């Protein structure tokens, strides 16, 4: 099969003629943890929200993500998951021009071309180990409109550089380049702000967030946008669908955030089981393992013609392919950081198809 | 305050200096008998299902859809609302040319306009008690790409005769125009079929329907669009965004058509205190009353210089100002039909606005 997203664990069991809970899937990134216990215990209480629309201003919501990220409720922007922040930027924003760098989250391109954009793809290199270098600078020039960068990139987990992304920062605010950067990931790298404590200086400068893969509520679909520009904002807002975000989304995001020991235990978890894990993987023979800061890591096959995927299904083990992202081929796969146990089934897994082997 | 839509009880509330829970609300228009009793108990049982992503392409819940309609699930795609619907058919159908019909729900020119369509309106008349009529048809003319109908209109109740819709069809077909009807508030209606099993033979014809104010779940955000164009469909689902609809959105939709007494038990309410509150409305002096098919009436008031909504929100009743509506003014609003008890303390309010004025 071809989807077009991880987490298709419907579409793969019907692959195999088996019923869905009977995968075990790593190839989508959700906390392991699960669910914050306040979010269950809450959406059992208030599940009587859903006779009535939700605000269509989420007073409440916007109110709980200012408070948590010390800035004003006008900055902020919630939406159906981050996806669809990333197609209010794009609509939004309505480029001319953009930029994208590749390989990255297919839905860039899906919603700039929906958009009408010219786009421009700034190639990572397997050379470089498919890390964003200063090469990229050369490449913005005036005539470009926005600028889309994943902090940390996926699938191959890998961060910029603070001075590095300064740095293009910087040359999108001379050249009038609006900087979108997608932080989809970054509460999972314990020290890691982003740069929404530097957007009241910045206005050029989008902020993309998503409580689906930190909280683990991937079904109730939440996300946000984060902006200075009071004009801009105004406008994603006017321009906006009306009561996008669900009512018990709503609730959970606003509960989560006040969950003081969920950063810490994860965390603490990705600091243990996910070091553990990542040196398991690289122990393995014919596989090379790109050093992810988030919950997932990027892997790369060295078996020659051998479909990872395919074989790890057979074992009702469900990975990533990413051989349909632009700049990766049919060697390289994503798999999901999970709990002990499971990484451990995973990599049992992958032992049988890369150990004892010439 | 001016709202694009009604079920602003917060907006409202704050206007007042109170709590939302203070408020009745007869601006939006649920069906009172509440959440379905399975629903409840299926959201609760599987609330798990959020900490996995819902299936893209929604197979149980397209499916379910499919059954109750007898038509290929192929024809079907669910929206995270109906509004996500109306946006979806405009967006994947582009048209040049489309005509709307005011006054009628606000979205279809909010999701015209952002596609870049030249709209045109047909008005309809006070002078015709705003009842679509067949002057409509010379209106109809070749460079049409589309017309949006809504059946019944919103806010006026009223439900275009089958002849006529069947010759505005008829016509549309020969024309090359595509007709759009918007179902969301025909399941109120007790003997009312629908376009959905005339497609089969009319893939111009694109019906829009709505789970949310029907089974009283706006909150969960459900709707869906029925075409029999497999390419259109194709078309529509590969623009798609994905994951719209949260997974207990997809649950409950699920549960809620195999509720067998919810139908039965909608309309002998909507025949009952329906038939009773229209009576009771009509009674009442300076204030005419339209024949509404759904769960919603249009109200003129006759009572000069006199703003309903603000004195009906200083006793604590929020009702819809149709002030904002294309073709509407200040002297019309429009009120839900709710339990009897709820809509006695509605009337008590108008009267006490409405009666004994000379």
Redesign the interface.
């Known amino acids: 099969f071809n989807?077009?997203?991880g987490?298709?664990?419907?579409?793969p069991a019907?692959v195999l003629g088996i019923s869905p809970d009977q995968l075990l899937?790593f190839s989508?990134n959700?906390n392991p943890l699960?669910?914050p216990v306040s979010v269950?215990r809450a959406?059992?209480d208030n599940?009587?929200?859903?006779?009535?629309?939700?605000?269509?201003?989420y007073?409440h919501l916007h109110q709980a993500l200012a408070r948590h990220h010390q800035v004003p409720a006008s900055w902020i922007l919630a939406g159906?998951?981050e996806?669809?922040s990333i197609?209010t930027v794009a609509?939004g924003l309505k480029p001319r021009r953009a930029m994208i760098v590749t390989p990255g989250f297919a839905?860039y391109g899906r919603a700039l071309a929906?958009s009408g954009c010219e786009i421009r793809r700034w190639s990572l290199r397997e050379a470089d180990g498919w890390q964003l270098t200063d090469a990229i600078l050369e490449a913005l020039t005036p005539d470009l409109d926005c600028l889309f960068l994943c902090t940390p990139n996926n699938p191959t987990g890998l961060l910029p550089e603070r001075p590095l992304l300064q740095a293009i920062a910087d040359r999108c605010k001379s050249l009038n380049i609006n900087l979108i950067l997608d932080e989809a990931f970054i509460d999972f790298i314990p020290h890691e702000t982003g740069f929404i404590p530097a957007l009241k200086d910045n206005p050029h400068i989008w902020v993309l967030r998503s409580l689906?893969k930190f909280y683990?509520?991937?079904?109730?679909?939440l996300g946000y946008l984060v902006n200075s520009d009071d004009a801009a904002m105004a406008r994603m807002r006017r321009?906006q669908?009306?009561?996008?975000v669900?009512?018990?989304?709503a609730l959970?995001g606003e509960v989560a955030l006040q969950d003081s020991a969920w950063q810490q235990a994860t965390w603490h978890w990705l600091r243990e089981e996910g070091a553990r894990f990542y040196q398991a993987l690289c122990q393995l023979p014919l596989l090379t393992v790109y050093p992810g800061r988030a919950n997932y890591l990027l892997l790369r096959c060295e078996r020659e013609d051998i479909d990872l995927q395919r074989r790890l299904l057979t074992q009702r083990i469900l990975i990533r392919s990413c051989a349909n992202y632009p700049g990766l081929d049919s060697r390289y796969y994503r798999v999901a950081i999970r709990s002990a146990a499971q990484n451990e089934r995973l990599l049992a897994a992958l032992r049988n198809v890369l150990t004892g082997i010439a």
Chains 1, 2 share one sequence.
């Not at 599940?47 to 201003?57: G, Q």
């Not at 669908?241 to 996008?244: E, I, R």
Request: glycine residues 8%.
């Open positions: 989807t077009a997203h987490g298709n664990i419907r579409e019907t899937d989508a959700i699960g669910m269950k959406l059992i599940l009587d929200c859903i006779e009535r629309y939700p605000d269509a201003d007073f159906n998951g996806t669809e197609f609509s839905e929906q689906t683990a509520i991937p079904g109730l679909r321009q669908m009306p009561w996008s669900n009512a018990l989304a959970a």
